[PDB]
């Protein structure tokens, strides 16, 4: 006895040790790194907003206006459901499942992920 | 509690924003390019990534090495980027990465020889218009929320004309007036 | 006017020979780069950083250079000493593709290092042709029969030698070894310099096992080492990766 | 013979012909001597956009 | 110290030759219109610059707007051109046809166009469509609103036939060109065409 | 006055007077006309205001 | 004085009127005319 | 081989007529202004 | 006989979504049978279904000690004597179907080190007659 709990605790403390090691190097102490070949500051891709959607047009309030308003906006679908992608699954996989509520939920999550655009 | 998390997300978005200091000049024929999607011109110029002949030539890795060279070129626009400077950072074959770098140099996206001081400017699009770019919440700066369709504008900016839009001026000439 | 142009700055070899950056090519707020802080859209504010004003001062002027069913990845090593310093690097090569000549890539590689000695372009390419001739029938194998080998893998980068031990099955072609190389770097938090190095150290071990399978025909599929939790039911892994500072 | 693609052809071609015939209206005698061309007519888009181009060529 | 030795021959971007060469390879339609208009200008002002003998990679670039014109010619009998896209392809095809007509009287860019076995097939297609108008058959009745899209089209094909008429001097018995043009001659009323 | 004015395209009486002074001085060379207003007005903008 | 600048502006933005205005350059008569004025003369033999 | 050469003098007149008789009278003046300037080179 | 003592002592309570109701912690069925057939249709002697059951139980039991942290591949690989080509195919399976990476602290999932993203930068066009902006 006391084998599987010891191995699982070793796995959990190893994952926690790696999580405590990499974030102090990347984000806490000097906030990034420096490339040796080019003048590019190394930064993790997790804080970079890897996707971009289409353009949005509007109009100013005053007529005969010459000001150009260029800016950014952040959009997300409710910020609660995760990005566990069910969209990389062909439609012939989940056909012999035992329930119908899971057939509702998988298609709901696939529509949630295919409605990433506004 | 919701507005406090929205303000914290706006503060960390101001912390990680990568503000612009130098302009990027692309030619007129290179207007078909988009960041996210892969165009049919890129699909027909290098057919080895899309015919699925080899396993080391995937469209995901092709999009990754397409974005990497362009990000390292646009973060430092004044530097002439070479093949050796990006070879030691990505793990791909030479006979295809030279094709990709020659594609990006041939179509004028990177390594473009221009001196913009001797060319006049024009006003192409309309004057009015709120041109806002739509980004997504990065996985890593999201709130914890132990158990929200609110948008946030990070940087507000105005321009008096397109000639100061080309020179990255944000009407700060009230401070540095002659 | 008052616009900085797009090109004509190639201060790269002086940073290769700057003797402070982690480059193994040549031997002889508080942020360093303002990629997260604004400069109020003024150019002069970039001159306060020493790693950027050195690029503005010590730059130079260059000229722009103007230029199959299954890929065979063969790692190519290089070790040539010339005028005090050495050249030590490694790069993969597609044996199936023949669009670029090794003479042409050696000319590009000597143009990038700012040598132009007109003899290293032949000296590198002769070693490239020699290794591609000696390794022309070693990576086109048809490996079956479920070897399930063990691999001790080492990475040599500036007294920071990376070491790991894992059991690999070189029969199925599902997992990409480049994906395996970058999954270790994403977890451990290393830089992008190990991204070529782990895969180029892995393909050499793969071709060594292919040499053992073709030249000697040794099967040696006899009890690979486990921890009695996975494959073999002894009592019901091997090691862990680490970065040692030598 | 076909009733579909000739009425959309009419609604396109007659609209383009009306846009061509309504393309010469801001260049009359008493229309150019007034000030309702230059002032506040950013919706016109034909003129008042090439003053940065004609000045760079010396045409004045 | 480094911004004082810039070469002035390439500091204005890339030159107009490769700019207009990449413009037709791009997908921007106004840029393609500008490139075809400037190539129509160069074909009148200096035909030796854009000749096929000097530039070998120029002959597949102009065929991509002339070869899909056959669908418009087969659809020319009725009002098939509805939007501003089929008319745009029509204008690009008739512009590139006149560019290749202007590149066909230079005694060096002619033999390659004779060796090209597809431009002559397009010429044969236009002549077979014009033979119905010259004879009076019930097939492919010409639309009177689209007669101005064909009267100025057939002249640029007859000019190319006049250009390539010297190199098809070995003629056969069942020659479609000699069968078509003798029926063209008995119908037309144009002095220049006769 | 000599201080900085308000936001652009307001065109107070000083800025309207100095441009009509400079046109009667030079009659060409708009680089020498834009700085007579005070320098804070563009060459491409003073022509659009004068027209 | 301003009438001379207006004559130099209007007779330079309206003398062409078929290269920046889209609906006048997308006309069947104007496109055929601009194509047909660039016809190079045919050589003899 | 690449050789950066000056392009030919293209007669781009400001006004754009469509009749042939309003083009030749300026084209002859353009030829007289072009050949007398390129004659002194050779 | 072995996991019953482990599941009772130091196991955090289970957070399961609605689209994960097909998952069975005891046995397998046709969804997991058809996804990775190399464990079942005689691919090798080492990819036995009992070892497959041991790994698919060990990963979902290792996640229970830290439900708010990212379960990496290497931390599983430290005490699993199985090929990484199967560890990735099971870890990506459980991440795709939303079991071991559903509700964690999102700053725990690592990404690739590299340059920043260029989606909001102002890029102009090289017109041969001007410098008009690119604002569609």
UniProtKB/Swiss-Prot annotation, chain C:
GO biological process, one term: nucleosome disassembly
Subcellular location(s) per record: Nucleus
Post-translational modification: Phosphorylated in the G1 phase.
Entry superkingdom: Eukaryota
Region named Interaction with STH1: 71-112
InterPro entries: Sfh1/SNF5 (IPR017393), SNF5 (IPR006939)
Keywords linked to the UniProt accession: Cell cycle, Chromatin regulator, Nucleus, Phosphoprotein, Transcription, Transcription regulation
Membrane spanning stretches: none
Record's keyword annotation contains Membrane: no
Record's GO cellular component terms: chromatin; nuclear chromosome; nucleus; RSC-type complex
One Gene Ontology term of the molecular function aspect: transcription coregulator activity
Record's function text: Component of the chromatin structure-remodeling complex (RSC), which is involved in transcription regulation and nucleosome positioning. RSC is responsible for the transfer of a histone octamer from a nucleosome core particle to naked DNA. The reaction requires ATP and involves an activated RSC-nucleosome intermediate. Remodeling reaction also involves DNA translocation, DNA twist and conformational change.
Quaternary state and interactors: Interacts directly with STH1. Component of the two forms of the RSC complex composed of at least either RSC1 or RSC2, and ARP7, ARP9, LDB7, NPL6, RSC3, RSC30, RSC4, RSC58, RSC6, RSC8, RSC9, SFH1, STH1, HTL1 and probably RTT102. The complexes interact with histone and histone variant components of centromeric chromatin.
Protein family: Belongs to the SNF5 family.
Other notes: Present with 3940 molecules/cell in log phase SD medium.
Name used for this protein in its record: Chromatin structure-remodeling complex subunit SFH1
Recorded name of the encoding gene: SFH1
From Swiss-Prot, chain E:
Location in the cell: Nucleus
Family assignment from sequence similarity: Belongs to the RSC9 family.
Annotated function: Component of the chromatin structure-remodeling complex (RSC), which is involved in transcription regulation and nucleosome positioning. RSC is responsible for the transfer of a histone octamer from a nucleosome core particle to naked DNA. The reaction requires ATP and involves an activated RSC-nucleosome intermediate. Remodeling reaction also involves DNA translocation, DNA twist and conformational change.
Miscellaneous comment in the UniProt entry for this protein: Present with 2610 molecules/cell in log phase SD medium.
Binding partners and assembly: Component of the two forms of the RSC complex composed of at least either RSC1 or RSC2, and ARP7, ARP9, LDB7, NPL6, RSC3, RSC30, RSC4, RSC58, RSC6, RSC8, RSC9, SFH1, STH1, HTL1 and probably RTT102. The complexes interact with histone and histone variant components of centromeric chromatin.
Name listed for the protein in its UniProt record: Chromatin structure-remodeling complex subunit RSC9
Organism, scientific name: Saccharomyces cerevisiae (strain ATCC 204508 / S288c) (Baker's yeast)
Residues of the full protein shown: 66 to 259 of 581
UniProtKB/Swiss-Prot annotation, chain G:
Coiled-coil ranges per UniProt: none
Residue intervals passing through the bilayer: none
Subcellular location: Nucleus
Subunit note: Interacts directly with SFH1, CSE4, histones H3, H4 and H2B, and via its N-terminus, with RSC8. Interacts with LDB7, NPL6 and RTT102. Component of the two forms of the RSC complex composed of at least either RSC1 or RSC2, and ARP7, ARP9, LDB7, NPL6, RSC3, RSC30, RSC4, RSC58, RSC6, RSC8, RSC9, SFH1, STH1, HTL1 and probably RTT102. The complexes interact with histone and histone variant components of centromeric chromatin.
Function: Catalytic component of the chromatin structure-remodeling complex (RSC), which is involved in transcription regulation and nucleosome positioning. RSC is responsible for the transfer of a histone octamer from a nucleosome core particle to naked DNA. The reaction requires ATP and involves an activated RSC-nucleosome intermediate. Remodeling reaction also involves DNA translocation, DNA twist and conformational change.
Other notes: Present with 1990 molecules/cell in log phase SD medium.
Protein family membership: Belongs to the SNF2/RAD54 helicase family.
Entry protein name: Nuclear protein STH1/NPS1
Source organism of the structure: Saccharomyces cerevisiae (strain ATCC 204508 / S288c) (Baker's yeast)
From Swiss-Prot, chain I:
Domain of life: Eukaryota
Residues annotated as domain SWIRM: 14-111
Compartment(s): Nucleus
The protein's role, per its UniProt record: Component of the chromatin structure-remodeling complex (RSC), which is involved in transcription regulation and nucleosome positioning. RSC is responsible for the transfer of a histone octamer from a nucleosome core particle to naked DNA. The reaction requires ATP and involves an activated RSC-nucleosome intermediate. Remodeling reaction also involves DNA translocation, DNA twist and conformational change.
Note: Present with 3380 molecules/cell in log phase SD medium.
Complexes and interactors: Dimerizes via the C-terminal coiled coil. Interacts directly with HTL1, NPL6, RSC6 and the N-terminus of STH1. Component of the two forms of the RSC complex composed of at least either RSC1 or RSC2, and ARP7, ARP9, LDB7, NPL6, RSC3, RSC30, RSC4, RSC58, RSC6, RSC8, RSC9, SFH1, STH1, HTL1 and probably RTT102. The complexes interact with histone and histone variant components of centromeric chromatin.
Protein name: Chromatin structure-remodeling complex protein RSC8
Organism of provenance: Saccharomyces cerevisiae (strain ATCC 204508 / S288c) (Baker's yeast)
